[PDB]
Write a protein that binds this ligand. Structure first.
Ligand SMILES: CCCCCCCCC(=O)c1cc(O)c(O)c(O)c1
Lengths: 233, 226
């Protein structure tokens, strides 16, 4: 499809090539003081989140039809889907067999270098990365799934039906692609992994809550807004 | 002191007698994350501690002669940390058994489900508190010190600090009559344990199997610096 193509091109452009990975701050072994953190750790955590949102916005806008939605709908879909998108894209990108996390800037950091600011969450993201990698999801299938995480029913949408339409389009796209490779829903093996992902979004929220308590440095406003908006109370 | 006496009397009156401990629901054994009944029990147990602590606080000399707002503030800010400290002092971590202020006795596994990790950390603190072997008068002073302390928003911060000083003198003289800061060193880690409490409630509030009781929920929100 020209849709699939658009989706894949959008995806690849939203992340680094093996060519341009950034190992400058990579350290194969760091010795941290666990269960505890300084302001630099927390800043880096927030910076990394912030960087993903900016990248994800730009990625979202290259999804056909996404850019035509109500501006409020655009923001809503992006806020509701951000953590889950951050985790999924990071898990798909990273190499858990080397304990290394790869961010969308190309930045490469090791489990131990993130342990301070992310806490346990980073270990659990890595566990998910393993389990994701074991179902072997090709880039076009991923380019569809990521879009599907974003483009989905959320409470408060102004034009729920346009969103559902755009959902339907992307789901067909995925279906045809899956048939092109191997005539099917299948998929259920992958959805079996989706509880792990929900849980990981919760951990994310819990971590931010905790850092917000501690307040060594305050969250960036956009991240803080998402934190608050996505709380069902 | 008549102060110390007042503090000790207040403390002892605020919990169960070995006589009236309630082992009815105690179970040594069980198995095997949590359901609504676990969460309800957690909130019930917190709720049960509330009114006991207000009544205890009012028997502290001078406490009752603070601004009503200051009274409520000091109580809301100190509730979790008081619940934890009194529970840790009261419980027997060697036997894995938690004793609540109703006299209810439960085993660490019987409330692991609803407290999560926090219960282990409370029990860890209980061990550590006990190793210091803190006698009842010293405890009666410490608990008061957790309550009567600087909080953001106090109307009469200095009266509170004066009352602090009084109680700290009381404690110091008592320890000498019989560490001087080994027990005071405990309070920092109690704050940390409060944090876990908050984190747990946040988590339960996310999953929402049952909502918090209003009074507990109010404390949760009011004690958030944002
Ligand atoms: C690998 C673990 C699962 C990750 C991929 C699943 C994507 C999320 C998903 O299917 C999904 C589920 C919905 O109910 C929905 O309305 C949507 O737009 C997408």
């Amino acid at each position: 499809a020209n849709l699939l193509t658009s989706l894949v091109r959008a995806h690849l452009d939203s992340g680094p090539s093996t060519a341009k990975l950034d190992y400058s701050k990579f350290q194969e072994l760091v010795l941290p003081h666990f269960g505890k953190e300084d302001a630099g750790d927390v800043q880096q955590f927030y910076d990394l989140l912030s960087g993903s949102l900016e990248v994800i916005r730009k990625w979202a806008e290259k999804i056909p039809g996404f850019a035509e939605l109500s501006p409020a709908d655009q923001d809503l879909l992006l806020e509701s889907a951000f953590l889950e998108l951050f985790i999924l894209r990071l898990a798909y990108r990273s190499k858990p067999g080397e304990g290394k996390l790869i961010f969308c800037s190309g930045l490469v950091l090791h489990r131990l270098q993130c342990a301070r600011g992310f806490g346990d969450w980073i270990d659990s993201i890595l566990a998910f990365s393993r389990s994701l990698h074991s179902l072997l999801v090709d880039v076009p299938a991923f380019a569809c799934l990521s879009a599907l995480v974003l483009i989905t029913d959320r409470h408060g949408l102004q034009e729920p039906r346009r969103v559902e339409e755009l959902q339907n389009r992307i789901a067909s796209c995925l279906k045809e692609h899956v048939a092109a490779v191997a005539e099917p829903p299948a998929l259920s093996r992958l959805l079996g992994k989706l509880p792990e992902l929900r849980t990981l979004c919760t951990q994310g929220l819990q971590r931010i809550f905790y850092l917000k308590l501690e307040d060594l440095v305050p969250p960036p406003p956009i991240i803080d807004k998402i934190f608050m908006d996505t709380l069902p109370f």
